[PDB]
Amino acid sequence: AWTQVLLGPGGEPKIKNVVHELRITNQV
Amino acid sequence: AWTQVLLGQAEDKAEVDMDTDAPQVSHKPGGEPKIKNVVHELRITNQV
């Protein structure tokens, strides 16, 4: 259930959003 | 830091931090010098 809910009786898996910011600090 | 401000560095050649993951606000070891733009004047008095 975690495997199928991860790709978009087994319970309810809560697979949370991971927040990422692409980032410039000093031209990098 | 005084040596860096005397050379006239503008420092938008390291372009500005959008968020606050070290946006260069610090009580620095260099500090923040602002050197005066002192004007020396060329003129003429008595044909000199």
From Swiss-Prot, chain A:
Transmembrane segments: none annotated. It is found in: Cytoplasm, Cytoskeleton. Dynein heavy chains probably consist of an N-terminal stem (which binds cargo and interacts with other dynein components), and the head or motor domain. The motor contains six tandemly-linked AAA domains in the head, which form a ring. A stalk-like structure (formed by two of the coiled coil domains) protrudes between AAA 4 and AAA 5 and terminates in a microtubule-binding site. A seventh domain may also contribute to this ring; it is not clear whether the N-terminus or the C-terminus forms this extra domain. Homodimer. The cytoplasmic dynein 1 complex consists of two catalytic heavy chains (HCs) and a number of non-catalytic subunits presented by intermediate chains (ICs), light intermediate chains (LICs) and light chains (LCs); the composition seems to vary in respect to the IC, LIC and LC composition. The heavy chain homodimer serves as a scaffold for the probable homodimeric assembly of the respective non-catalytic subunits. The ICs and LICs bind directly to the HC dimer and dynein LCs assemble on the IC dimer. Interacts with DYNC1LI1; DYNC1LI1 and DYNC1LI2 bind mutually exclusive to DYNC1H1. Belongs to the dynein heavy chain family. It is linked to Charcot-Marie-Tooth disease, axonal, type 2O: An axonal form of Charcot-Marie-Tooth disease, a disorder of the peripheral nervous system, characterized by progressive weakness and atrophy, initially of the peroneal muscles and later of the distal muscles of the arms. Charcot-Marie-Tooth disease is classified in two main groups on the basis of electrophysiologic properties and histopathology: primary peripheral demyelinating neuropathies (designated CMT1 when they are dominantly inherited) and primary peripheral axonal neuropathies (CMT2). Cytoplasmic dynein 1 acts as a motor for the intracellular retrograde motility of vesicles and organelles along microtubules. Dynein has ATPase activity; the force-producing power stroke is thought to occur on release of ADP. Plays a role in mitotic spindle assembly and metaphase plate congression. This is Cytoplasmic dynein 1 heavy chain 1. It comes from Homo sapiens. The gene is DYNC1H1. The chain holds residues 921 to 968 of 4646 of the full protein.
